Amino acid sequence: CSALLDPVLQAPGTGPAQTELLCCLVKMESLEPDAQVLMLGQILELPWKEETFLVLQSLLERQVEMTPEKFSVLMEKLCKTTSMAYAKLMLTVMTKYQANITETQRLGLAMALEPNTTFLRKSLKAALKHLG
Amino acid sequence: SVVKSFKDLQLLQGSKFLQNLVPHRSYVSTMILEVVKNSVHSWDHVTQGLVELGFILMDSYGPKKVLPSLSRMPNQHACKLGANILLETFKIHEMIRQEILEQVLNRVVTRASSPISHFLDLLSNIVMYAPLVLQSCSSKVTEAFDYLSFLPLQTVQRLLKAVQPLLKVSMSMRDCLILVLRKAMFANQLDARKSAVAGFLLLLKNFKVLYNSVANETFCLEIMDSLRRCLSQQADVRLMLYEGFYDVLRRNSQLANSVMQTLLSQLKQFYEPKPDLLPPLKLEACILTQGDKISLQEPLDYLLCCIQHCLAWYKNTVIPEAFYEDLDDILESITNRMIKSELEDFELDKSADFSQSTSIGIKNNISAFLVMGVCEVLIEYNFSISSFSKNRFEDILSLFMCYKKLSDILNEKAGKAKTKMANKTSDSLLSMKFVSSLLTALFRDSIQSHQESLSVLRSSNEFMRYAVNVALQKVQQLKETGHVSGPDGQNPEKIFQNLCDLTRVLLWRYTSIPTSVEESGKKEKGKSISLLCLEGLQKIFSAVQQFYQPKIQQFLRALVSVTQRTAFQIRQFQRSLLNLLSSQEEDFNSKEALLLVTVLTSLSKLL
Amino acid sequence: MQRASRLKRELHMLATEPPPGITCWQDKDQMDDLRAQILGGANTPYEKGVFKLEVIIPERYPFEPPQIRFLTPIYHPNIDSAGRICLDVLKLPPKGAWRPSLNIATVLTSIQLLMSEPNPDDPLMADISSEFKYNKPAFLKNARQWTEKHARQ
Amino acid sequence: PTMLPECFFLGADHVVKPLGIKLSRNIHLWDPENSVLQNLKDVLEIDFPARAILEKSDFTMDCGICYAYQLDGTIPDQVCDNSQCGQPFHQICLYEWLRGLLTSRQSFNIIFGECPYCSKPITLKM
Amino acid sequence: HDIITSLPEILGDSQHADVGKELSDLLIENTSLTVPILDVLSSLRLDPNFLLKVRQLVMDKLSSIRLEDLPVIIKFILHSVTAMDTLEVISELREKLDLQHCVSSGQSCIILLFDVIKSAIRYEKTISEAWIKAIENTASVSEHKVFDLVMLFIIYSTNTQTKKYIDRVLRNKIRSGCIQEQ
DNA sequence: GGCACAGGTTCAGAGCAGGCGTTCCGTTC
DNA sequence: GAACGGAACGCCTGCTCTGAACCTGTGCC
Ligand SMILES: [Zn+2]
Ligand SMILES: [Zn+2]
């Protein structure tokens, strides 16, 4: 994953065919917590596009453990945006890592939900307002 | 060895010659049966081969000919053995009858590429003797429901009549069943909707008369709510509900009140209950037009059938209150407002030209048939209420003047186009029963009080030949298939009684009045009512000899052993053929003579 | 497995209730196979003899009979110079008569029965089956001398 | 629990027949107001013995092929249809007996054969 | 998965075919949800031509499918099979299938696949006849595979009317210097 | 002249029966 | 007596029988 994930995603014309196996990578029981954490150190170091998010939602879907060091960066990075993928990503973070949401990170999420392209905004802001 | 056995038999009956000479030597039919019998002393090496043989026979000579004598009869008689062999290994060997009934449904189910009516009638007599077996063999019955959307109507319709004795006792299997029928209702395959109806119509029929009654009267109203989806679903699947709900009513009386409202709602979607609106019914909402595919769905003539039958049933058997006294006035109003519906009401004859490619022609053609069959359901009703009241028989005349105008109109339309229009020869919905009682009233009533009302229908010669023709249509249905069209459909005894009543009048008019008295010309000589009486007579005696093999005695009792009765009846066709032939040579009635013969033939196979 | 469940009742049953003139214990040399002692049948030339037998239990026992030989030399019609036994319940059907309705004791009883009553119609030794029949005292002399050199102490 | 349980019979096939037959007659006379025992005693029209364990402490209710109870979960269930033998057996033991012999004759997934002890007809349904 | 399963109760009749296309869109787009899609398509109201198309669009990606789902897949193929689409799908089926490729859970579902194929071919002579007529038409190649053998043994084990025909075909095949040790 | 029954005809395909191949025995020089 | 030509039983195939459908002649309005 330290080798291959980057190039699959740092390739252009990465389609459904490519993503579905990095989907299966993250979703294997065998991909132990420790390794989902190491996946995180890697998924997070890449330029974020739609292809990074979809896989990352499914890694974060487990409740992969976070040092607040990385969670903040995930949230910082998350908070830098029009996308359906990203909508659901943010939503799923804020239900599982509600627990990890600071006042400052909830401001970042207030920033990140500013968009009106955001589908399911009612959901996202209801979840956000529910943290407040 | 076995088949030879049958070739030997058949041959030896046919001729007088061989019977004389040969002393009737043991047929391997009777020998093997005695083998099965004497495995009771429990030689259980034997039995595996007996099961093996009985099946092989049912395999090799199944009716695939039907999906003469020489290719049909000695190849009925191979499995009819097969059947008796396996029936007796099941009724004698208690250990086996698990693998026997396993292997029967093995063949009934996933097949239906080659037919299996013989297997179904084996299965039937297996389970009827001792259903108790079926409770060890539920495994197969659970995986039979699996494919109970890809099996066609008749496998499933019967397979389940057999099984259901299980589902009164077992319950986990019943929560497998309604589950399967429901998941079939929402199918692709058109058969699966109708599988759903049939399992549901039968769960509603024999799953209680009215476990606890309260967990059945609710469970019937549960599924019947899931059937108001099916009352919404496509034409055919609706049709099956109009027809099956009459038997649900007979076997489950107390759901009458609920089922009435289930229907009467579906009526009012097309009934406009205002006096002085001249088309009383909405015929154009029965018709779905999309992308020039113009389908009738919700057949109203067939809805009136179910209505009109549930009606007389409620008058007669449930009573010994407001919906039926309303429906009297509903039918009286549809009566009086339809009488005065002048083709102008339903855009026919002049505003439509029933042009059978066009959307408009397909719509108008669908509705003329709907009108015609509805006219028939109400001709029945006008006759039904009154004991020969001159007003309601004048009502009947005018309802028929409606029917006949639409009929001779589609005849003018089919007198131009090719005779692939078998849609006009789509069943007249009159119950065979009424036909009977009717024709008796028509041809066999001399009571002065009725006679003024009947002189209406009798001056009406077409109503006579109409009634008859329906007699012919019905009996034909019985010939083709093992049941009739209308009510009383699959209950042989009723059918038999009607046929007896039929015979009585067919002969009565055939005799009292000959063919030589006609005053009508060549077009009415090609369908003189005498001739049609004789032809009706024809199809009966034939069909009797297919099914009613035991009761042929009773058929004659209607009308001293089998031979004097048959002789006296033979004399009547015999004297008729003499009188037909001797009188004229000029232009002798070929067909009259022809079926006088086909008759004298049929009588002869008896003697 | 079944070997264990039979042998369990049998070892225990041959320590607690063995047949008369007979013992069988789990061998001290061989802690898998059984050692028997059948003491010379009364009013036979085997009188004053203690006859050691090894009983080999087969693996699919009790579906197969026990496998028994006379380890003490025995001068007998149905027993040869290597201790091989002419016995029906030492073979399976139809040649033999072993089945699970039997056990090691019932056969070791049938062995002391054959020591007392040699069968001359299943001869392994034709010289001894003939001598047994036609010069009984020469058989009984030789078998009693046999009992004094080999079955004595 | 008080409601009707699924119940069935092990033993000699001549003894099980009237019991099954009387259960089928009297299963509608089950009532969930009584106990399971107070319904079974009036359904099957019997009593139950109180621990024939202590009197029959060695009746040899062992396979009489392998001479063990508890071979791999299985119980001595298959018996003889005979008053004089009544000897129980196991599925595995009786099958490896009746398949091994000549005399034994199999219909489909059944073996008919002779009971080892008494040589009377005994049936095994796998 | 549940929405999918509930789509037949939800949708009205105008909007069946629509959903059809976009479900085939979802099919290529995600594998995991092959099963309920299929179940759905078969409990929709559609046009059979489209169903041929999607069935090929099963068949092309059938190497990509985890084994667990295959049985109900291949059950679907053999209820979508006509009398006329027999050898077509069967030759294609017979090719694309591997059963070398799959191999502790693998072996169990292979067995369960074979149970399901047994029940298919057990249960329509249509397949058995044509199946064979498709293995005899592979007497050409020395290279016909493990499946063809195991499958023959199977139709002889299950299907009875054919026993002579299997033996005939096997004898005319085996003499020919086809099936051998390897 | 146009359409539909009738019967001819044509083909799939199931099943039967006899002539051959390998081997023994009566007949004629 | 012995050499030649016919009798005997297991295998394969061509002939026959059938039945199902289509089509082309011809019968009537
Ligand atoms: Zn045992
Ligand atoms: Zn016994």
From TrEMBL, chain B:
Disulfide bonds join 375-402. Residues 46-201, 429-607 form the FANCI solenoid domain. Residues 211-410 form the FANCI helical domain. This is Fanconi anemia, complementation group I. It comes from Homo sapiens (Human).
